[PDB]
């Protein structure tokens, strides 16, 4: 939820410049290459699988991209394909569809 | 009692019998007499033959219609036209 992120991203940031002052550098110019450095120097954790040591990345990569509401205050969804239960995919399929069709009518190290 | 060299004969062309009996046994077996040569060697009594025989019947409906329909539906094995929806 918003307020959450939200309050996770300030959190976030003042715990920046408290790690950029005990490591005695710029406030400002604090990088996550040194969040990373400062973190792993104060909490030394030899545990083998990376994703278990300590971390302070952003909110952003800390949290799952949770999505958002789809219908608002009076109950009607946004995307018209809302109802087929994957209206990204089949809006991008729909798209997908509509430029084949026009392109009908109108006539290497990359996977 | 029959005029011999007549029945069931086939003039082998240019000496290739292979093809020659090749042919000679589709004729005997399209008038199924291989067919009745096999099921006459043990006597088939006749209660065993009356199945046999509606069953080869049944079969033979459910074969046929089966191939007319395989045949009907085999214009629909074209490509997608409406690929993406």
Known sequence: ?111 | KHLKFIARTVMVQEGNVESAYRTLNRILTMDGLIEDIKHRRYYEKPCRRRQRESYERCRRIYNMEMARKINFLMRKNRADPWQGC
């Open chain 1, 1 to 111: 939820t918003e307020d959450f992120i939200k309050k996770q991203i300030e959190e976030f940031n003042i715990g920046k410049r408290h790690l950029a002052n005990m490591m005695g550098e710029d406030p400002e110019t604090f990088t996550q290459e040194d969040i990373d450095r400062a973190i792993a120097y104060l909490f030394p954790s030899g545990l083998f699988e990376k994703r278990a040591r300590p971390v302070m990345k952003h909110p952003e990569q800390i949290f799952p991209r949770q999505r958002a509401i789809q219908w608002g205050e009076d109950g009607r969804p946004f995307h018209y394909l809302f109802y087929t239960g994957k209206q990204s995919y089949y809006s991008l399929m729909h798209d997908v569809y509509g430029m084949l069709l026009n392109l009908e009518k109108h006539q290497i190290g990359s996977r």
